[PDB]
Amino acid sequence: SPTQEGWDLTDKATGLLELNVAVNMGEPDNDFFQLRADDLRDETAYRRRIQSAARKLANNVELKVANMAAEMGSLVITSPDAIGTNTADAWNFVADAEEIMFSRELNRDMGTSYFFNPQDYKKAGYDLTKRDIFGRIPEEAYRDGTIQRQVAGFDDVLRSP
Amino acid sequence: TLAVDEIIETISAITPMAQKAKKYTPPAASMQRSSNTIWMPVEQESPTQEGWDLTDKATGLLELNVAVNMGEPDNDFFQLRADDLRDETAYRRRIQSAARKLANNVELKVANMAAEMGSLVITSPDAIGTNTADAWNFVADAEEIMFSRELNRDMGTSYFFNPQDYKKAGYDLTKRDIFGRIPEEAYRDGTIQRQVAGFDDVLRSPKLPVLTKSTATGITVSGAQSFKPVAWQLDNDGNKVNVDNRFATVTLSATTGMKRGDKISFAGVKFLGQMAKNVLAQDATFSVVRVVDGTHVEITPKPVALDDVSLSPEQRAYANVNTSLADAMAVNILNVKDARTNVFWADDAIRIVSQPIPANHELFAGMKTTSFSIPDVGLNGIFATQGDISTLSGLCRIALWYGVNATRPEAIGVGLPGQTA
Amino acid sequence: GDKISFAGVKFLGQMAKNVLAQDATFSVVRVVDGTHVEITPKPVALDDVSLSPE
Amino acid sequence: ENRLESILSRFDADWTASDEARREAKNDLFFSRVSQWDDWLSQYTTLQYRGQFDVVRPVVRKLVSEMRQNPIDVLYRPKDGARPDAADVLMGMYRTDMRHNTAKIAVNIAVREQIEAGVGAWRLVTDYEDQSPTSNNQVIRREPIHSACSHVIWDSNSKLMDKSDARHCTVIHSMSQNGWEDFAEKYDLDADDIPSFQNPNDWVFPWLTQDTIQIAEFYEVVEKKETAFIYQDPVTGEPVSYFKRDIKDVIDDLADSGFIKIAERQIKRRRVYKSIITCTAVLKDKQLIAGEHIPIVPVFGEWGFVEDKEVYEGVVRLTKDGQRLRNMIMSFNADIVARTPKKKPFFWPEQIAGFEHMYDGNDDYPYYLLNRTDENSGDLPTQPLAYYENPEVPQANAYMLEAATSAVKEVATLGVETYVFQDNLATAMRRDGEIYQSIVNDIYDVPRNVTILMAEVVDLATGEKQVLNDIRGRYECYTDVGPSFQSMKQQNRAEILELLGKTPQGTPEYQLLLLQYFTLLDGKGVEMMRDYANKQLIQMG
Amino acid sequence: IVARTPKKKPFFWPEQIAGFEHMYDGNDDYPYYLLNRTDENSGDLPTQPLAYYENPEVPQANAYMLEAATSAVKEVATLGV
Amino acid sequence: TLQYRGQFDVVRPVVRKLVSEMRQNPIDVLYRPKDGARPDAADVLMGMYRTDMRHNTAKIAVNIAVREQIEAGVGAWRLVTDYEDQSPTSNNQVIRREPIHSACSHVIWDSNSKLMDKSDARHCTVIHSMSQNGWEDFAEKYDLDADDIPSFQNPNDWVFPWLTQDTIQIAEFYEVVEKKETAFIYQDPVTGE
Amino acid sequence: QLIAGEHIPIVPVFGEWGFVEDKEVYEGVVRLTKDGQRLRNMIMSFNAD
């Protein structure tokens, strides 16, 4: 909404403007197969094909989600070097994301998520382990590869294959 | 074509400074007849002599004061066409957006007032993330300059970072190659700490201003000027009008490149101990609040000098500067580069005067009025609706009247990192 | 999916309309011509003079 | 992390989750109480006839009168295995502090709002009374809540008709300026700081708005295990008293008077806290209040969940379409009658040139004359006289008026009878009795009946304050529903009459007649009759 | 059908009531209505009985099917006997 | 499109009449001694059933099941046990009854069940859906990690005209195993075995 | 001027009473019939004319 100052506001009223976005569906994801009657005397391959079809459909959904998120994303944080060189580069990356989202005054009541590819996740784990001290976070990143479940104000930080 | 009922929530604002600043509502009839201004006395400072016989050495009494006033209403006047689906829908989302926008405007005015009337100026020659613990050094510098001047921090203190410098401080904390509790929290969450270097509240504010650099150069004081504290002075009619204490108009050679909000410091003057009058090693910093004429400015801390000869002892008891301006003092400008500001203050230095708009009165018949509550901030305005059949359009207005005041500009501050060149 | 940024255009506060220090970044979603593209954030200028108050 | 942050987050979750039902209930209340032309943009769109030919309000009146003719009240009965008179004292207290006008007014308001919108409520509060206390210089009274749909916001994660499992509930208070001043005086708040809260009426119906001040009260229930001290009664047995109730007041006075500590146990119980809040700060943080339950009792009409969303409905929601159609059609027909040319003849000016005073309406002539000739055509053209057609109501208008009236008649039939609504009211009264029982156990002086008289055990602190001592053997009576009686004597009279109505004319009938005479009010003649009955009963052993 | 349908009003050529329009306004200030009679080119106005827009009607199909559907629901919504 | 749509309801009065009719005739359990058992064998069990089923929650749960049975075709309710320290029925415990709203989509039964009461079902899942605060309560009550928000097959559908729908889901899977386990035949120090 | 009693000496009697939105509304038996009565008076006056 806009605003204006003063007492006398004759002929200074404004209308109303409400905007819209569109959400739709797309191509169905299918799995076909044809079998003759003699080929169903065992049925093990048929059942296993059904199971693998379910698993592959789920994987396709995840691939589409990752691609759409990576293809239409306005905020871009770029670094002129790898995410392994110099200390706390992974933290600086995640915190730069948090800072732009905060300064833009965007709505984050539902939570925030960060997703690393496995190479960058390993680099961040290295950043934690080479720290020359093992308090608790370095110990967890040494035993398991986990950075943590929350970094620089992000509700959920994960690795995505 | 028509839309579903689920709102895509797009923005979310927070108003920490406005929430933290106190709110004051003086009596309405008194303000109406007083022209929406009211005076409050300032804590009394007493002189002191030493000796045995004091014939004809008895002093008088002096008690300065400051004034708080109000500006103009902040409205959301808008229109409602009769035959419109787009106007029939969303005329409540418009009210919600108006509430959020009004709270945001209040917070913005608070932040701008604090930045442009903060006298205490801390400056740095480089950015925060360069050396180790530089952000802590910044906050500690603010605390130390407030402690040395013996200001009243009884009701709390506060330091507001901008998001970039908050991230710089968090980076400085996490890069330590160690993990205890402070580094662990600054790594998991972005928060450095809540208390830092002495302040009992250290927040990050998303809408601090940017203090653009001042192009002023080669300005000098024109003529010796001595400023004297008074509580009142006589006008042309002989009526005693009160005199405000948090301003002083000073004549320079030429005020080119100066604006409201530049931070200056004359070469030679120094801060005092306020209570004890012990000379500090920190140059006195002032803030220009108005550029009047081409040779005048208004600076917010009135430089009452300790070495002044024309000051009576009861006036010298209010001194805050070691020496007076002397017709040649070069005035240095402290903001020599653009930078988003960090703002620290004592929690009782900013207040928000508020007044009602009595539009519920019977004189305003035909229009329907409700109390409107803007969120976060504790402010109430009016929500009025009317409608003229001539244009067949209901008119809806939301009004809310406030004035942001800095009662103690000597307690408000401005942190300026990277002020090189 | 390519990421672009127009020289001189900076982000805004989106509530307070205060200029951010960082360049506005857009992501192209469609190349429709040899001279026309489609970017996912609309660049609504603050200082535009043809824009109604609402 | 902030207390206000958490409270406001909970309230906003509930406020958004109860959004559609509240708006529909407000629509029902406005439709059934203010006007059936509930459009607001049509307030400035050129005046047209808008009649109000109402046919739903008589049904609401009939249902309200039916629910008024059968009052329902709490009725405490002894538990299985309890002493036969384990509920008489609690029943006496309930009648004593619920016989006032405010209790009946709150119940009637809730019932009317349940019938019209679908949801109503009332509140149970405790006050310090000096002149006529019920027990321990205090009273428990009942207060009304108007527009409960938009004013009482329950915990969203609550799936019971009476909201027993709600962990919190916020009630929005709207008051005039003098009302806010008195509220601040009562709760020791600051009168200068005008409070603020979300408007209960939201912004639907932007008219019907008053200069009112809003504040909120947030109740929450915390279930935890707390310490209970098991003393040995200097009279007989061992009572158990909570440590939080005699923590400092009489923790040593018990021993000084002669209570010896036996053991120490951890017993789970619920404690209720009330907070006074605005949209910006908490004025009273966690003030503990008496009882184990949230003091709000809701009444529902037709209630359910559709998809994790609670829907309630009275009797007005369905009739609204037919009634609106009926009003619109009647308005159109009124316009037809009003703005329509009447039946008059069509004339050429030359047909009556010179005779125009014959047709003005008077009755001074025996016939009408017409001009016959023209100086150009020789003779005027002959055409049969035509009259403007009489106004008529279209068959569509008449048919749809009958159809709309019939549809409202078909749909505005609650039940066959208000059995379901009365059962829901009985459920609300059972919840009321539960809450009242807990508050009484918390603040009143409940004597213990020994089989060896009532033994009230209490002791004062050094600050002259008296602390109630209620044992942990307190839930000895369970709640029920029964006819509303003003006093225990009225209840006993009704019971004796009911027994008399079924016992045949024998020795029990004589005994019950003498008992009914004994339980009569006092004048002079009834005094003589009651003395006679008393003496006969005493003599008969 | 009830809401959006033209109502019963007369059909007029403009030359029939040219000059007398205020008579057909809807007021009851006149004892009758006047009409134009002559034309300077056609001599006299053509003669034809006045037509009125037909009143709105609910079709027999709509009425029959409303009754049939209501009866069908009433019959099938009998739980048990 | 922008076209008129009116509900001239004629099925709701029938549903209201049926609900009132079946509410006017309340029904509960009645325990009766078996053949050859003592005449007062079911007194204790009946008394305990009445004690912990006299509450409002039991009546409301049964009413909800009845209304959903009339409208959709199936309703349900649940029996749970809790540790009550103030007014326990026995052994410092109570057995209470809880409602289930929209059982047709929130109570998924064993598919290989051919009985109306589902006594030949070997498992059943109940889908508990709620909001953020409800999830915090559920986690803190059943000792779960409230940070990990659970997800399950959402039994509700996106109702377009509704502003807000909850997003927290979890499942409770009951399964029954019938097996031969060891039982000890002690000798009573008082009498019998 | 102090008067006897603890209550305001005015006793109000209501018909249909309630609150709509922080606004008290009451009604008798005549308010709803006014539109129909006025329409009937107008129509009978038209017929008399």
Whether D415 and F20 lie within 8 Å, measured CB to CB: yes
> How do beta strands D152-154 and D168-175 pair?
antiparallel
- Give the HSE-up count for residue D205: Cα atoms under 13 Å, Cβ half-sphere: 24
Cβ contact D301:D119 at 8 Å: yes
> What is d(CA B269, CA B247) in angstroms, rounded to the nearest whole number?
17
Q: Tokens 């050396």 map to which residue? A: B131
> SS in 3 state form for chain B?
CCCCCCCCCCECCCCHHHHHCEEECCCHHHHHHHCCEEEEECCCCCCCCCCCCCCCCCCCCCCCEEEEECCCCEECCEEEECCCHHHHCCCCHHHHHHHHHHHHHHHHHHHHHHHHHCCEEEECCCCCCCCCCHHHHHHHHHHHHHHHCCCCCCCCEEEEECHHHHHHHHHHHHCCCCCCCHHHHHHHCCCCCCCECCECCEEECCCCCEECCCCCCCCEECCEECCCCCCEEECCCCCEEECECCCEEEEECCCCCCCCCCEEEECCCEECCCCCCCCCCCECCEEEEECCCCCEEEECCCCCECCCCCCCHHHHCCCCECCCEECCCEEEECCCCCEECEEEEECCCEEEEEECCCCCCCCCCCCEEEEEEECCCCEEEEEEEEEECCCCEEEEEEECEEEEEECCCCCCEEEECCCCC
Return the number of other C-beta atoms located less than 10 Å from residue B27's C-beta.
11
Minimal-distance CA residue of chain C relative to A101 = C13
Q: Among all residues of chain B, which has the CA nearest to that of D210?
A: B370
In single-letter form, the type of residue at position D131 comes to Q
Place of tokens 């033209």: E6
In this structure, what DSSP letter does residue D380 have?
P
* Of B4, B7, B85, Cβ closest to residue F160: B4
How far, CA to CA in Å, does F16 sit from each of A133, B284, D301, D412, E74? Answer: 72, 83, 11, 11, 14
Residues B30, B266: Cα–Cα separation, whole Å: 41
Size of interface D-F (CB pairs under 8 A): 124
Write the CA distances from D80 to D446, D447, D478, D480, integer angstroms.
20, 20, 9, 14
Within 10 angstroms of residue A37's Cβ, the number of other Cβ atoms is 6
**Domain of residue B331, residue span:** 211-339+408-416
Whether the Cβ atoms of residue A3 and residue B105 lie closer than 8 Å to each other: yes
Determine the distance in angstroms separating the CA of F154 from the nearest CA of chain D, rounded to an integer.
Answer: 10
Exposure of F190 by Cβ count < 10 A (0-12 exposed, 13-18 middle, 19+ buried)?
exposed
Task: State whether residue C48 sits within 8 Å of chain A by CB.
Answer: no
The C-alpha of B378 sits at a distance from chain C's nearest C-alpha, in angstroms, of 19
Closest CA to D199 of D153, D145, D144: D153
Resolution in A: 3.1
For the record, the structure tokens of A130 come out as 């080479």
* Phi, psi of B313, rounded to the nearest 5 degrees: -55, -35
- The secondary structure of residue E10, as a DSSP letter, is B
How far does C54 lie from chain B, in Å, by closest CA? Answer: 9
Residue B58, CA atoms < 13 Å, CB-side half-sphere: 3
* Cα gap G4→F10, rounded to integer Å: 60
Rounded Cα distance between A159 and G16, Å, is 66
To test the contact with chain E by mutation, choose from D49, D326, D395, D402 the residue with the greatest count of E C-beta atoms within 10 A, namely D395
3-state secondary structure F114-147: CCCCCCCCCEEEEEEEECHHHHHHHHHHHCCCCC
Question: Which residues lie closer than 8 Å to B331 by C-beta, 6 or more apart?
Answer: B219, B220, B221, B252, B264, B265, B266, B267
Mark yes or no for CB contact C16/B13 under 8 Å.
yes
Residues in chain C: 54
Q: Name every residue whose Cβ is closer than 8 Å to that of residue B36 and which is 6 or more positions away in sequence.
A: B69, B70, B355, B403
Query: Are C and F touching by the rule of 3+ CB pairs within 8 Å?
Result: no
Note the residue count of chain G: 49
> Residue E77 burial (CB < 10 Å; 0-12/13-18/19+)?
middle
D156/F131 Cβ within 8 A: yes
Q: D192 CA to chain G: closest CA distance, Å?
A: 23
Q: Give CA A23 to chain center in angstroms.
A: 19
CA-based nearest distance E68→chain F, Å: 13
List C-alpha distances in Å: B354 to B30, B378, D82. Answer: 13, 10, 63
* Distance of alpha carbon D489 from alpha carbon D474, whole angstroms: 24
- d(CA A88, CA F154) in angstroms, rounded, equals 40
- Minimal-distance CA residue of chain A relative to C28: A72
Helices and strands, counts by H and E, chain A = 4, 3
Q: A120 Cβ partners below 8 Å, 6+ apart?
A: A83, A90
Q: Backbone phi, then psi, for B345, in 5-degree steps?
A: -155, 165
Q: Report the amino acid identity of residue B19.
A: Q
Residue B13 Cα, gap to closest chain C Cα (Å): 7
Cα D424 from chain centroid (whole Å) = 12
Decide if E73 and F10 are in contact by the 8 Å CB cutoff.
yes
Considering only CA atoms, give the Rg of chain B: 25
Chain B residues with beta carbon closer than 8 angstroms to that of A95: 167, 170-171, 190
The one-letter amino acid code at D189 reads L
DSSP string over D209-265: ----EEEEEEEEEEEEEEEEEEEE-SSSS--EEETTTSSSSSTTHHHHHT-EEEEEE
Q: Report how far Cα B209 is from the mean position of its chain's Cα atoms.
A: 12
Give A107's contacts in chain B (Cβ within 8 Å). Answer: 9-12
E74/F10 CB distance under 8 A: yes
Q: Among C15, C16, C40, select the one facing A74 at the smallest CB separation.
A: C40
Sign of CA dihedral A48, A51, A57, A60: negative
Set of chain D residues whose Cβ sits within 8 Å of the Cβ of G42: 338
Contacts 24+ apart (CB under 8 A), D524-529: none
Judged by CB atoms closer than 8 Å, whether chains meet at F11 and E70 is answered as no
**Residue B231 tokens, joined:** 């509580």
Residues of F in Cβ contact (< 8 Å) with B2? 2
Q: Which residue has the tokens 């009604």?
A: G27
Q: For residue B5, give how far its alpha carbon lies from the nearest alpha carbon of chain F (Å).
A: 5
D9, containing H or E segment: helix D3-17
DSSP per-residue letters across D29-72: HHHHHT-S---SGGGSS---------SSHHHHHHHHHHHHHS--
Q: What is the DSSP letter of G42?
A: H
Percentages of chain A per state (helix, strand, coil), in multiples of 5: 40, 5, 50
Chain G contact set for D54 (CB, 8 A): 32
| Helix and strand totals (H; E) in chain C | 0, 3
What is the residue type of B120? L
Residue A61 vs residues A28, A58, D51, F14: alpha-carbon distances, Å:
11, 5, 58, 46
Contact between chains at A14 and C52 (C-beta distance less than 8 A): yes
CATH number where B229 lies: 2.40.30.240
Cβ neighbours for B8, distance < 8 A, ≥ 6 positions apart = A21
Least CB–CB distance from B163: residue in A13, A103, A138: A103
Regarding beta strands B350-355 and B22-24, do their DSSP bridges make them parallel or antiparallel, or are they unpaired?
parallel
Measured CA to CA, the distance from residue D453 to residue B88 in angstroms comes to 71
Contact B57, B49 (CB under 8 A): yes
Please report where in the chains the tokens 């005693």 appear, as a residue.
Answer: B240
Q: Give D-chain residues touching E3 at CB under 8 angstroms.
A: 328
Is residue D312 within a helix (H) or strand (E), and if so which, with residue range?
strand D310-313
Which residues are CB-contacts of D329 (< 8 A; sequence separation ≥ 6)?
Answer: D397, D400, D401, D404, E2
Neighbours of B343 (CB within 10 A): 24
Whether A16 contacts chain C with CB within 8 A: yes
Structure tokens at B333: 């400008």
Determine, for residues D53 and G46 on separate chains, whether the beta-carbon distance falls below 8 Å: no
CB-based contact, B187 to chain A, within 8 Å? yes
Q: How many residues does chain A have?
A: 161
Q: Do B100 and C15 touch (CB under 8 A)?
A: yes
The helix (run of H) or strand (run of E) holding residue D3 is helix D3-17
Using an 8 Å CB-CB cutoff, list chain D residues near E10. Answer: 388-389
Q: What is the C-alpha to C-alpha distance for residues B263 and B285, in angstroms, rounded to an integer?
A: 7
Residue of D nearest to E63 (CA): D399
G42-47 contacts: CB < 8 A, separation 24 or more?
A: G42/D338, G43/D337, G46/D337
CB D213 within 8 A of CB D279: no
Set of chain C residues whose Cβ sits within 8 Å of the Cβ of B207: 13, 15-16, 18
Task: Name the neighbours of E, counting chains with at least 3 Cβ pairs within 8 A.
Answer: D, F
Cβ contact, residue pair C16, B108, below 8 Å: yes
User: What DSSP character marks residue D486?
Assistant: S
Smallest CA–CA distance, residue F107 to chain E, in Å, is: 26
